[PDB]
Every structure is written in structure tokens, then in C-alpha cells.
Design a protein around this ligand. Structure first.
Ligand SMILES: NC[C@H]1O[B@@-]2(O[C@@H]3[C@H](O2)[C@@H](COP(=O)(O)O)O[C@H]3n2cnc3c(N)ncnc32)c2c(OCCO)ccc(Cl)c21
Length: 195
């Protein structure tokens, strides 16, 4: 006869659900549902210096921007919610740590992530999930190849392949890498395989 994994706040743990744990070294940002419990806690008092203006929703502070995003998306109808071409969202002003590579990744809210499904939070892997590719292109976020086989400059590569840019997974198949990364997550106490 997937996985859940924790990402620690850099400054609180954010649990994500993924069907692609093998791609963990390519997760370049996190996305929470706009109504996720942790959003208010994770929101920074001010924007980082040098923040991309595309990330701020035009708000003077992260809290103002999140409040406006929540208010605006309430003006959407079923028509907009079943369209999916355009990806919108807001940076919280804070970072999480990717458990695989120890790197800081920015945290966003976006209405493409649904509050009542999974854990209400995802890891975003633009190289390998077209939804995340689209968001990353719209926001100027990094797009990293970890599964060789496609051409990430053109579109997300969603098929089987060989791990690259993924340290102790490198050279594995996708099925083998899924098992290896879950074993690492379990050894560290930071995740589990789930149906
Ligand atoms: N996004 C990075 C990574 O991770 B996945 O994105 C998460 C998760 O795994 C997947 C779970 O969907 P499924 O259960 O199979 O229908 O949809 C996203 N999801 C998880 N919870 C949410 C959520 N509340 N709102 C929106 N979307 C979500 C994922 C892919 O999913 C294909 C479907 O399996 C495909 C490629 C890759 Cl690399 C991934």
C-alpha cells in the first residue's frame, strides 16, 4: 500500500504540509493563509530596510498592510476566487529558517493558501510547483532548481528526476529523496510522513 515539517521563526514554529518533501532545499519562502493564527504574532513592527515595494501592499507598516490585505480580499467574489492567474499577497516583515539548509526565508500571507486545508501554511518551491513559480515571478522571489529534468527558467518542473543543489540528497531519485528527507526530519524531531 506527504509530510509535515516545522520551520522555526528566525526571531514559534510554523508547520507546513507538503506532498514534496524531497524539494525542501528549494523552498525559498513560506506562505500562510491570511487567517492563519500565527500571522498576527509573526508580523514585524516595521519593514526591513530595502524591502521590495511589491511586497508591502502599499502599507506603511506590516500590520497596516496585513489589515488592508484582509479587508481587500473580503471584496472578492466567487468569480475572483475561482480565477487563479493572479497571485497577490503581503510580506509579514519576518523570516523563518528552512530546516534543510538553515537559510532564512521570508514569510508571506496570500489568498492562494486556504486556511482550512492541510495546516493552513505551505513551503513555497517555485522551481517545482507552478503556483509558487507564478507567485515568485510576480514578487521577485528566488527560484531554485532541486529536481533536474526540466527548465525552470520557462516553467516549474513537476515530474520525476534527479536531486541537485540538495547536499545529502544529491543524485537520488524523487522517491528515494522523499524517504531520505523524512528520515532526516524524524531524526531531528522536525517532521513526519503523513497520508
Ligand atoms: N508547494 C511546494 C510543495 O508542497 B505542495 O504544496 C502544498 C502541498 O504540497 C499540496 C497539498 O495538496 P493536496 O493535499 O495533494 O491536494 O498543495 C499545497 N498546499 C498544502 N496546503 C495548502 C493550503 N492550505 N492551501 C493551498 N495549497 C496547499 C507541492 C505540490 O503539490 C501538488 C499537490 O499535492 C507540488 C509540487 C511541490 Cl514542489 C509542492
Amino acid at each position: 500500500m506527504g509530510a509535515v515539517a516545522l520551520f522555526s521563526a528566525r526571531a514559534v514554529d510554523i508547520e507546513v504540509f507538503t506532498t514534496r518533501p524531497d524539494t525542501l532545499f528549494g523552498a525559498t519562502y513560506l506562505v500562510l493563509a491570511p487567517e492563519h493564527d500565527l500571522v498576527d504574532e509573526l508580523v514585524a513592527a516595521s519593514w526591513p530596510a530595502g524591502v521590495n515595494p511589491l511586497w508591502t501592499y502599499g502599507g506603511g507598516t506590516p500590520g497596516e498592510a496585513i489589515a488592508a490585505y484582509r479587508r481587500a480580499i473580503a471584496a472578492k467574489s466567487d468569480l475572483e476566487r475561482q480565477e487563479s492567474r493572479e497571485k497577490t499577497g503581503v510580506f509579514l516583515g519576518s523570516y523563518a529558517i528552512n530546516p534543510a539548509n538553515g537559510e532564512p526565508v521570508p514569510i508571506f500571507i496570500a489568498d492562494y493558501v486556504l486556511a482550512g486545508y492541510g495546516t493552513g501554511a505551505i513551503m513555497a518551491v517555485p522551481g517545482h510547483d507552478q503556483r509558487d513559480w507564478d507567485f515568485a515571478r510576480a514578487f521577485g522571489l528566488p527560484i531554485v532548481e532541486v529536481i533536474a529534468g526540466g527548465n525552470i527558467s520557462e516553467s516549474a518542473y513537476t515530474g520525476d528526476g534527479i536531486l541537485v543543489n540538495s547536499d545529502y540528497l544529491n543524485g537520488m531519485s524523487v522517491p528515494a529523496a522523499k524517504r531520505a528527507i523524512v528520515d532526516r526530519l524524524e531524526s531531528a524531531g522536525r517532521g513526519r510522513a503523513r497520508i
